[PDB]
Amino acid sequence: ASTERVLRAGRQLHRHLLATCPNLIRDRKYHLRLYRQCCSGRELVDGILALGHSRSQVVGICQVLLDEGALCHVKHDWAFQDRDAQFYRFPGPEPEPVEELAEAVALLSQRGPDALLTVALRKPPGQRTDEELDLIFEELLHIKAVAHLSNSVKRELAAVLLFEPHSKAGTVLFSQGDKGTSWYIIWKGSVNVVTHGKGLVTTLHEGDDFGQLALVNDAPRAATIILREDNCHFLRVDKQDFNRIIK
Numbered sequence: 264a265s266t267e268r269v270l271r272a273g274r275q276l277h278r279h280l281l282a283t284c285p286n287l288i289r290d291r292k293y294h295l296r297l298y299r300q301c302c303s304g305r306e307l308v309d310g311i312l313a314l315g316h317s318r319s320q321v322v323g324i325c326q327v328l329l330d331e332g333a334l335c336h337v338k339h340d341w342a343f344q345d346r347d348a349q350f351y352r353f354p355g356p357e358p359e360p361v362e363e364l365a366e367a368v369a370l371l372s373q374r375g376p377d378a379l380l381t382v383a384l385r386k387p388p389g390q391r392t393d394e395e396l397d398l399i400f401e402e403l404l405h406i407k408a409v410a411h412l413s414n415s416v417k418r419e420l421a422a423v424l425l426f427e428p429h430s431k432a433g434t435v436l437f438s439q440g441d442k443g444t445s446w447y448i449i450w451k452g453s454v455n456v457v458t459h460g461k462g463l464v465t466t467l468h469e470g471d472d473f474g475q476l477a478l479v480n481d482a483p484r485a486a487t488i489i490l491r492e493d494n495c496h497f498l499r500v501d502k503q504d505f506n507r508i509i510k
């Protein structure tokens with residue numbers, strides 16, 4: 264969690280919006296509903312652009328603020344909406360009025376693409392827009408484990424790929440001898456490969472994959488997979504999809 268810096272970055276941005284867009288955060292009436300001291304997502308993005316390269320970048324910045332609590336949706340939704348009908352508030356107490364803004368924009372922009380990729384991934388398979396599938400596809404272009412596959416194939420994987428986050432190191436993902444149900448790509452983190460006979464046989468890092476032996480050979484898992492770091496993030500492909508798309 265880099266939550267503390269996002270917050271102060273958000274706090275820093277929040278100060279320059281009130282100064283540059285004095286009527287961005289106001290009372291609003293939508294469908295005869297009244298929302299106090301809020302802004303629309305679409306106008307929030309607009310205002311961030313007005314400060315002074317792309318809209319998708321700014322959308323990523325907003326997603327990052329929503330994620331770290333530096334921005335909160337009126338209707339408690341987790342995907343940021345670049346829309347007129349969606350309203351957001353800054354939280355925390357009012358900050359003091361107004362290079363620090365520059366580095367606050369950079370820190371937020373650095374995390375934007377991942378924030379937007381996570382939203383696409385958190386969308387269950389079959390409920391992904393072409394734009395979300397577009398984001399997941401471009402990510403597979405950066406994964407060593409699938410580089411030898413065709414774009415058509417990567418596209419198929421994007422359609423069925425499953426997002427599987429974890430938090431604690433030392434978690435046993437599956438054990439030697441278990442029925443093999445799924446293929447795994449390491450988006451973030453690393454894992455230990457442990458066999459009963461030799462102990463730690465190897466370490467896999469971001470961009471590697473594991474768990475195909477059990478699917479390809481119709482056999483029990485040949486090793487225990489243990490999370491080596493905090494916050495491992497996996498892309499998972501279930502057996503049926505793996506077999507249909509990789510056999």
Ligand SMILES: Nc1ncnc2c1ncn2[C@@H]1O[C@@H]2COP(=O)(O)O[C@H]2[C@H]1O
Binds near residue numbers: 478
């Ligand atoms: N030396 C190794 N022995 C066995 N499995 C390994 C080894 N190195 C990496 N692996 C991976 O560990 C996985 C454990 O489950 P699988 O047998 O399905 O697929 C295996 C491989 O992807």
